[PDB]
């Protein structure tokens, strides 16, 4: 394992609230469909659903604040972020998030993604370190500060990075019948505060044969060396990009519009309103 760092400040950062508009839709399956409208019941992000915007770290005076909370998982999670800074590197999923139970660790870095399932003893304020190498004049990984120890490991997976390099990243996480399923999409945008209007379905990223309870998760962040000085001020980092959006999936019935190339271009939340209930009864 590694040593742990106490980052959470006495002064917390307040969450904001926004809507999902019509986002969070994803290809429920790998079945090809073309020029057709398909009805399916599954865990979807209801339209205009309650969404929370968290700021994990901030520099004001230059005062430091940190509040990177452990959130519930409920029936599934919609996660989104806007950052060109590669600050968000992954997530931790599990129940107790300590050595008493298994937990899922998903970490990205420049070269690969690592996914592990272990009895982890997690730091209260987990994170990854990065610093600016002055001779190579570039950013590099410093030290993991995520967990104190890890045993009983039952799953390890390595592949290519997907969080690395006006860019909206969207993820949906489900934990069903032993599989942790991840869907994602990258979209370019010109909006700052609120989730953009428009439609974009998320493509299947990976199904993982994990087989564990998940009731909570926490985001993993990469912090600059600049931020770890012993003072309360951080002059060497415009940390405002370290924020993310969280909504939650619900069992809903949706109509999905597949165009002639098999792409989902529109959807209907049948329970949203009478008009949608009508389009679902009519099936057109």
């Amino acid at each position: 394992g590694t040593q742990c760092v106490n980052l959470t400040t006495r002064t917390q950062l307040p969450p904001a609230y926004t809507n999902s508009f019509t986002r969070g839709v994803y290809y429920p399956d790998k079945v090809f469909r073309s020029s057709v409208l398909h009805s399916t019941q599954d865990l979807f992000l209801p339209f205009f659903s309650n969404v929370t915007w968290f700021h994990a770290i901030h520099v004001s005076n230059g005062t430091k604040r940190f509040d990177n909370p452990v959130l519930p998982f409920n029936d599934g999670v919609y996660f989104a972020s806007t950052e060109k800074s590669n600050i968000i590197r992954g997530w931790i999923f599990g129940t107790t998030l300590d050595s008493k139970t298994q937990s899922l660790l998903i970490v990205n870095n420049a070269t690969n993604v690592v996914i592990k399932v272990c009895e982890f003893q997690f730091c209260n304020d987990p994170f990854l370190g990065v610093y600016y190498h002055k001779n190579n004049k570039s950013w590099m990984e410093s030290e993991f500060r995520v967990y104190s120890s890890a045993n009983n490991c039952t799953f390890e997976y390595v592949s290519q990075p997907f969080l690395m390099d006006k860019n909206l990243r969207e993820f949906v996480f489900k934990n069903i019948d032993g599989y942790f399923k991840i869907y994602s999409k990258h979209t370019p945008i010109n909006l700052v505060r609120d989730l953009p209007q428009g439609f974009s379905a998320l493509e299947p990223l990976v199904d993982l044969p994990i087989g564990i309870n998940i009731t909570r998760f926490q985001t993993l962040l990469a912090l600059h060396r600049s931020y770890l000085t012993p003072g309360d001020s951080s002059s060497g980092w415009t940390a405002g990009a370290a924020a993310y959006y969280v909504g939650y999936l619900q069992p809903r019935t949706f109509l999905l519009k597949y165009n002639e190339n098999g792409t989902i271009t529109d959807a209907v939340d049948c329970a949203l309103d009478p008009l949608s209930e009508t389009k679902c009864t009519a099936k057109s």
Epitope: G129, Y131, H133, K134, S142, E143, L228, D232, S233, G236
Partner: antibody, heavy 119, light 108 residues
């Protein structure tokens, strides 16, 4: 303006304990991380320990890990170093120093206090 | 993590003294230089390899090169005879380190 004044140094037998104090003035103590650095007579500078602005985190040099405890009382603008299980090799002037805000060096130094460990 | 600098450097008055500090960490992070005279607390001379504090005269210049940083003192005078220490900090902010120190002797 800024002042750091050490106290608590003296002569003590090996294995005994001693508590150093540093009284800070002229700046917002609580906003700055604080260090102890030491210097054995005739020898060079050795970083000993650092404490964060709010005490949330503490780091110790390997030579003193397990023996020394750094702490602070921001309401009294006072930094402390508790030295337990002193060894002959702890004989040194102990300096209090301020961690520059925003970098990795020391921008202000105390006048030092002498600790002599001897049987 | 450890910083290696020569124990003694001798220069004549008016000449340029060059004190080197080497170590792998120096390729990653900034180095800092301090002057200490007998019976006194150290005084910052160079920070971030090359920058001078307001009180530090222009005769003190810092440079860097791979795993070695260099403090250059031009126009060396008698008052510059002292011990000079290089300093760094690790990647994660858990450790500060001093070099062994260099005694600068002014000849004549």
């Amino acid at each position: 303006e800024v002042q750091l004044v050490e106290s608590g140094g003296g002569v003590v037998q090996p294995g005994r304990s001693l508590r150093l104090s540093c009284a800070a003035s002229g700046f917002t103590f609580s906003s700055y991380g604080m260090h102890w650095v030491r210097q054995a007579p005739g020898k060079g500078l050795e970083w000993v320990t650092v404490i964060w602005y709010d005490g949330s985190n503490r780091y110790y040099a390997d030579s003193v890990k397990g023996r020394f405890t750094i702490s602070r009382d921001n309401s009294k603008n006072t930094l402390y170093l508790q030295m337990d299980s002193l060894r002959a090799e702890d004989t040194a002037v102990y300096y209090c120093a301020r961690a520059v805000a925003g970098e990795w060096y020391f921008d202000y130094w105390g006048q030092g206090t002498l600790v002599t460990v001897s049987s | 993590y450890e910083l290696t600098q020569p124990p003694s450097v001798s220069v004549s008055p008016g000449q340029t003294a060059r004190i080197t500090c080497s170590g792998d960490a120096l390729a990653k992070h900034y180095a800092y230089w301090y002057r200490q005279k007998p019976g006194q607390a150290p005084v910052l001379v160079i920070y971030k390899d090359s920058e001078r504090p307001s009180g530090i005269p222009e005769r003190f210049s810092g440079s860097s090169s791979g795993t070695t940083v260099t403090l250059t003192i031009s126009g060396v005078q008698a008052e510059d005879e002292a011990d000079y220490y290089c300093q760094s900090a690790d990647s994660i902010g858990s450790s500060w380190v001093f070099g062994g120190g260099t005694k600068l002797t002014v000849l004549g």
